Design an enzyme around this catalytic site. Structure first.
Site, mmCIF file in Angstrom:
data_model
loop_
_atom_site.group_PDB
_atom_site.id
_atom_site.type_symbol
_atom_site.label_atom_id
_atom_site.label_comp_id
_atom_site.label_asym_id
_atom_site.label_seq_id
_atom_site.Cartn_x
_atom_site.Cartn_y
_atom_site.Cartn_z
ATOM 1 N N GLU A 88 0.804 -1.219 0.000
ATOM 2 C CA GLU A 88 0.000 0.000 0.000
ATOM 3 C C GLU A 88 0.840 1.273 0.000
ATOM 4 O OE1 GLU A 88 -1.085 2.100 3.016
ATOM 5 O OE2 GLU A 88 0.279 1.146 4.436
ATOM 6 N N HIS A 89 2.152 1.179 0.205
ATOM 7 C CA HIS A 89 3.031 2.301 -0.106
ATOM 8 C C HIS A 89 3.752 2.167 -1.443
ATOM 9 C CE1 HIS A 89 2.832 4.810 3.520
ATOM 10 N NE2 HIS A 89 2.584 3.679 4.153
ATOM 11 N N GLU B 115 9.595 6.872 6.667
ATOM 12 C CA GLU B 115 8.278 6.810 7.286
ATOM 13 C C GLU B 115 8.334 6.164 8.666
ATOM 14 O OE1 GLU B 115 5.846 4.850 4.311
ATOM 15 O OE2 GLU B 115 5.467 6.697 3.195
#
Lengths: 439, 101, 414
Positions: A59-60, A136
């Protein structure tokens, strides 16, 4: 109008299937916009030990190079249609949704099929985005509340895949391969487990046609194990923090019990407080009135989170370290007050607050389509509002004392402590003061 | 009639004794916490005058000595200031009780 | 769905816009022009003090009765305010609005505001200002308005440090007596019927400053925290004008918040051209602050300290090459569609829909439906965009800055 006029005027949220395993559903609405999303029942629960963080990685990673379109021509076309695109992956449920306008609807469904089944991956992309995900993690290291909840899971579920953090450890991040990542893609997305949920200015005929017209060719054709809630304490003493974060939680019932709704009533009575409210000495919540009175907490939230027949019936307060045991004392005091002397007026007030929170929650586009997607990944169905009004009317103070006598009264807790924990008592004080000997 | 009850009141106010130490009516009140709220909520100038009269009274009773004739606070010119504030505090007390029952 | 809105401007000065739809979550907004621009240098912090003073004793019903009754029916009351306005928003079920309406009446037109609760409110002001300024951007924005008004619009949304305690509630009561008059009230309702609000707003209110110029200049803050913030704005366009709509399409062309999470501002050409200009982790946006009699427009930059002014020069050259007509026109059309999506997705809910429908109602005098506003988004020529950018370049400057400001120019090297 009245309550029958309230519950009568209601849409119906038509569902269907495509014989590929595609559970498609939609709700009509009156706005001139829409939100079309795919909820994939695949988070940290559907992994192995050796690949913590695969789903977070996807999803990143699924926006920087598609199959037909180059390096960012997906996002280029998304800002070309002028719409919002979002993705978030929980520990069990993953969401990819497009908040778009009605006119670019076949474009919307085509780009969503591109995101779902048509992603490319390059090794320069795994390199650069690996650096991005380490950035992140640097971002996540100071977001204290997520650190608390990750502590809470990581002690409550020793062994099971639920205690896998979604991000994964960074040493599981910087050793991956694209083939094993796509092996996860090719094993854990396949036949039944995905809802094409849409909401807004469309039709179920229209969305069914676009589902058949776009997603046909997913070619969809062996998990979901129980979870041992262990129950313990984890603590991170670090006195270079000004504010103390303590969470305590017990076992959650899940989804296959209306005791979920009973705990919603109870945690509507107890609920939440922050230091930036209006009127402190006149709060109906006795915990809130006392915590204003002796100036104990900065904030707290007493709530529920549940996974499939498990989860964390939870509470989380932030306060200074010279006031911790007082806050813990009054918190357990309100829990046991609901355990033994649950009278009627507090139950009435909690049911009003449950009405308000539930109705004002189910609003808009994304909360509606979020509700329907996570409903039809878990239940097999969507709950109508008549069911909510009925299961509000079903539960009184007798049901409250039944549920509180089972779920709270002398059960082993999970305590996540973070920060200045120097006053925070030992686990056996939580055990011995957790029940009452009628004092 | 009504004149006679007021004369009993005037006699009792003179025989009570707290006009001989210069005090006034609202300065002899026994403290619950409602009294403490009413004392907290006062305007500043009357609060200062209250503490001055109280301090003279504690002084004079320390040397066990009464004020002269001329400085006695005569009847019904004393300020009846506390009864609005204490009235409202007791009213909010009754409000909490009638709301939670 | 054969239902739609209902309107009446009651001619002694108030607005009622009811919308009887079939949604249970009913909301009542009450919108007043009583923001920071009606408060001057001798009573600062007073609108902030009034915002946190939602829950005091009103004439007849004390704060206990109010707080416990509104929590017992379970309604939620939020109050939001801007430099122009205040907004009382009570949200609840569809059936329980009359007693909450009477509590709204008490909150508005029943002031007591007693002194000990005002002291507790002083403590609350300190806590609220800390929770506000623990995020950097709002600090930058209040610096920005302070750097571009020589009058009452430069004031904060908050209490300054020297107005804590020195404010007394009779200043508030005189503020009530001179600004909470009945001709200044826009009562908007979602989920309620017109005759209910017609009776209440007709019988139940019953009461009855100058223009802001352009300051020009800069405000610096040496902060030393490795995240340099810099906002640069010129005076552009007041309320109402499709000129201001052209500045809105201009900021869509430049770039607003990312429509894709984990993206890199794809059609947002400021960050593309400045990523071409500077190869670093940073963050660039545009910004527009329209108000009634004047307006403002500019850009905003979060950056590393070592490459800040490079970004400011690069984006400034981007504004210059757009104001000198070097662009494409269907990209202006796609950004018009971006503002279409933005306006239609600022009215998704009940809440923001209520907010901007009522603020437009209080501003424009009458309601305007959104579809003709979308037509007005598409129906502005590209020459308006180019002339608006050239007007922004031609004007003066207003710069607020915070952070390690040892690598950021002042005026000339902007």
């Amino acid at each position: 109008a009245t309550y029958a006029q309230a519950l009568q005027s209601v849409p119906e949220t038509q569902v269907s299937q495509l014989d590929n395993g595609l559970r498609v559903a939609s709700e009509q609405s009156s706005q001139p916009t829409c939100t079309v999303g795919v909820w994939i029942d695949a988070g940290s629960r559907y992994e192995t030990e050796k690949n913590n963080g695969a789903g977070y990685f996807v999803e990143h990673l699924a926006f920087k190079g598609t199959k037909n379109r180059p390096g960012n021509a997906l996002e280029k076309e998304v800002e070309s249609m002028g719409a919002h695109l979002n993705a978030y992956s929980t520990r069990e449920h993953t969401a990819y949704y497009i908040k778009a306008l009605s006119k670019d609807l076949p474009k919307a469904v085509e780009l969503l099929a591109d995101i779902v089944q048509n992603c490319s991956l390059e090794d320069s992309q795994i390199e650069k985005e690996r650096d991005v995900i380490l950035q992140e993690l640097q971002e996540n290291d100071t977001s204290m509340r997520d650190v608390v909840f990750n502590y809470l899971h990581a002690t409550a579920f020793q062994g099971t895949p639920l205690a896998q953090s979604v991000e994964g450890p960074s040493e599981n991040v910087r050793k991956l391969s694209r083939a094993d990542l796509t092996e996860y893609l090719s094993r854990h997305y396949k036949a039944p487990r995905m809802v094409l949920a849409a909401a807004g200015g469309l039709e179920h005929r229209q969305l069914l046609d676009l589902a058949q017209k776009h997603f046909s060719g997913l070619s969809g054709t062996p998990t979901l194990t129980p979870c041992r809630f262990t129950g313990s304490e984890i603590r991170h003493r670090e006195d270079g923090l000004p504010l103390a974060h303590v969470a305590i939680a017990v076992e959650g019932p899940g989804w296959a019990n209306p005791d979920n709704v009973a705990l919603q009533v109870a945690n509507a009575i107890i609920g939440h407080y922050d230091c930036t409210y209006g009127g402190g000495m006149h709060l109906s919540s006795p915990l809130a009135s006392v915590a204003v009175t002796n100036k104990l907490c900065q904030s707290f939230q007493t709530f529920n989170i549940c996974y499939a027949d498990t989860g964390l019936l939870g509470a989380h307060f932030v306060c200074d370290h010279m006031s911790i045991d007082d806050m813990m004392f009054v918190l357990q005091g309100q829990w046991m007050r609901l355990c033994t002397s649950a009278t009627e007026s507090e139950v009435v007030r909690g049911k009003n607050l449950l009405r308000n929170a539930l109705v004002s929650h189910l609003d808009g586009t994304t909360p509606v389509c979020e509700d329907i997607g996570r409903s039809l990944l878990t239940y097999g169905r969507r709950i109508p509002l008549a069911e909510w009004e009925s299961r509000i009317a079903e539960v009184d103070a007798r049901v409250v004392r039944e549920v509180c006598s089972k779920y709270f009264y002398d059960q082993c807790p999970a305590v996540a402590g973070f920060g200045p924990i120097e006053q925070l008592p030992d686990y056996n004080r939580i055990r011995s003061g957790m029940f009452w000997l009628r004092f | 009639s009504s004149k006679w009850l007021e004369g009993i009141r005037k006699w009792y106010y003179n025989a009570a004794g707290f006009n001989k130490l210069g005090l006034m009516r609202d300065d002899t009140i026994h403290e619950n916490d409602d009294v403490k709220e009413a004392i907290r909520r006062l305007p500043e100038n009357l609060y200062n005058d209250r503490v001055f009269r109280i301090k003279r009274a504690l002084d004079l009773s320390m040397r066990q000595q009464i004020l002269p004739k001329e400085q006695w606070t005569k009847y019904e010119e004393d300020k009846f200031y506390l009864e609005p504030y204490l009235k409202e505090v007791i009213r909010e007390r009754k409000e909490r009780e009638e709301w939670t029952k | 769905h054969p239902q739609d809105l209902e309107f009446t401007r009651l001619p002694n000065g108030l607005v009622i816009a009811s919308l009887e739809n079939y949604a249970p979550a009913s909301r009542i907004g009450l919108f007043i022009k009583a923001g920071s621009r009606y408060e001057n240098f001798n009573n600062l912090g007073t609108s902030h003090l009034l915002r946190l003073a939602s829950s005091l004793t009103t004439k007849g019903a004390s704060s206990f009765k109010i707080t416990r009754g509104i929590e017992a029916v379970g309604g939620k009351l939020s109050v939001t305010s801007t430099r122009e306005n205040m907004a009382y928003t009570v949200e609840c079920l569809r059936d329980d609005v009359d007693i909450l309406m009477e509590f709204l009446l008490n909150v508005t037109t029943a002031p007591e505001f007693r002194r000990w609760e005002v002291a507790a409110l002083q403590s609350q002001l300190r806590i609220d200002k800390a929770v506000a300024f623990q995020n950097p951007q709002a600090h930058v924005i209040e610096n920005l308005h302070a750097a571009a008004y020589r009058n009452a619009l430069a004031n904060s949304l908050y209490c300054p440090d020297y107005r804590i305690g020195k404010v007394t509630p009779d200043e508030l009561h005189d503020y009530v007596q001179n600004h909470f008059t009945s001709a200044r009230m826009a009562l908007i309702g979602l989920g309620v019927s017109h005759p209910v609000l017609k009776q209440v707003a007709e019988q139940f209110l019953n009461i009855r400053g100058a223009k802001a110029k352009y300051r020009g200049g800069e405000i610096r803050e040496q902060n030393g925290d490795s995240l340099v913030h810099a906002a640069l704005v010129a005076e552009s366009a007041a309320i109402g004008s499709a000129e201001a709509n052209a500045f809105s399409v201009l900021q869509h062309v430049l770039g607003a918040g990312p429509h894709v999470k984990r993206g890199s501002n794809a059609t947002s050409s400021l960050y593309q051209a400045v990523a071409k200009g500077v190869h670093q982790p940073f963050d660039v946006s545009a910004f527009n602050a329209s108000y009634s009699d004047s307006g403002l427009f500019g850009f905003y930059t979060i950056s590393q300290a070592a490459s800040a002014g490079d970004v400011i020069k690069a984006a400034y050259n981007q504004v210059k090459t757009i104001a000198q007509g070097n662009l494409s026109n269907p990209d202006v059309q796609a950004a018009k569609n971006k503002l279409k999506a933005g306006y239609l997705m600022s009215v998704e809910s009940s809440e923001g829909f209520l907010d901007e429908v009522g603020c437009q109602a209080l501003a424009a005098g009458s309601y305007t439906p959104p579809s003709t506003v979308l037509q007005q988004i598409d129906a502005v020529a590209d020459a308006d965009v180019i002339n608006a950018a050239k007007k922004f370049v031609s004007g003066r400057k207003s710069m607020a800055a915070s952070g390690n400001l040892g690598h950021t120019p002042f005026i000339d090297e902007l």
